[PDB]
Amino acid sequence: EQVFHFYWLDAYEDQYNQPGVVFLFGKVWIESAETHVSCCVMVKNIERTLYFLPREMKIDLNTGKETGTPISMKDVYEEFDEKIATKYKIMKFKSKPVEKNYAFEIPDVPEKSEYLEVKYSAEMPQLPQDLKGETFSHVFGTNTSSLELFLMNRKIKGPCWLEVKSPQLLNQPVSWCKVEAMALKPDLVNVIKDVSPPPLVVMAFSMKTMQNAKNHQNEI
């Protein structure tokens, strides 16, 4: 295979124009030039995560008439597939069971419970924040950002040394870096601890302007 080390320093995202892609900029090592150079890596196909809370019973959406059959997990999985996904044009998604804990201000939520974890790609639209349905009472994770989700999932705490697995080449230069790379899924990035930080390049500058005598404007 192929894997290389990286030292990231900054990150960037553009939700409005390129959904589901996160850039990472930093330092990489080259033996031939015996110095560290700049590099950028693209992580793509970051999918949203949504947590659906199953309702403790069913509730009719007219007057809250609970007719009688208890709510099972399969009901919640079917409900999103048949109605919610169709209503908001969701093509592909993967769902599974999870167990989660809640200890915050939103009421009518148990301390420990089983939820429905659903995931779908970043190109589909976004559900409303207050969606409700037959078998689910509330939904969490609607408006999470891609950068936050990446850092919280991959357990990155500030600058660190990273292993990037299976790099691919880019069609055209997207960054002014001397080196470029890309990855297909966030699972291919990992953190290591036993390396000292590399040196950096520091630039300072000063500027002097002058207000034009005739017109009001500042020229450097």
UniProtKB/Swiss-Prot annotation:
It is found in: Nucleus; Cytoplasm, Cytosol. It comes from the Eukaryota. Disulfide bonds: none annotated. The modification Phosphothreonine is found at residue 69. In eukaryotes there are five DNA polymerases: alpha, beta, gamma, delta, and epsilon which are responsible for different reactions of DNA synthesis. It is linked to Pigmentary disorder, reticulate, with systemic manifestations, X-linked: An X-linked recessive disorder characterized by recurrent infections and sterile inflammation in various organs. Diffuse skin hyperpigmentation with a distinctive reticulate pattern is universally evident by early childhood. This is later followed in many patients by hypohidrosis, corneal inflammation and scarring, enterocolitis that resembles inflammatory bowel disease, and recurrent urethral strictures. Melanin and amyloid deposition is present in the dermis. Van Esch-O'Driscoll syndrome: An X-linked recessive syndrome characterized by different degrees of intellectual disability, moderate to severe short stature, microcephaly, hypogonadism, and variable congenital malformations. Component of the alpha DNA polymerase complex (also known as the alpha DNA polymerase-primase complex) consisting of four subunits: the catalytic subunit POLA1, the regulatory subunit POLA2, and the primase complex subunits PRIM1 and PRIM2 respectively. Interacts with PARP1; this interaction functions as part of the control of replication fork progression. Interacts with MCM10 and WDHD1; these interactions recruit the polymerase alpha complex to the pre-replicative complex bound to DNA. Belongs to the DNA polymerase type-B family. The CysA-type zinc finger is required for PCNA-binding. Catalytic subunit of the DNA polymerase alpha complex (also known as the alpha DNA polymerase-primase complex) which plays an essential role in the initiation of DNA synthesis. During the S phase of the cell cycle, the DNA polymerase alpha complex (composed of a catalytic subunit POLA1, a regulatory subunit POLA2 and two primase subunits PRIM1 and PRIM2) is recruited to DNA at the replicative forks via direct interactions with MCM10 and WDHD1. The primase subunit of the polymerase alpha complex initiates DNA synthesis by oligomerising short RNA primers on both leading and lagging strands. This is DNA polymerase alpha catalytic subunit. It comes from Homo sapiens (Human). The chain holds residues 338 to 557 of 1462 of the full protein.
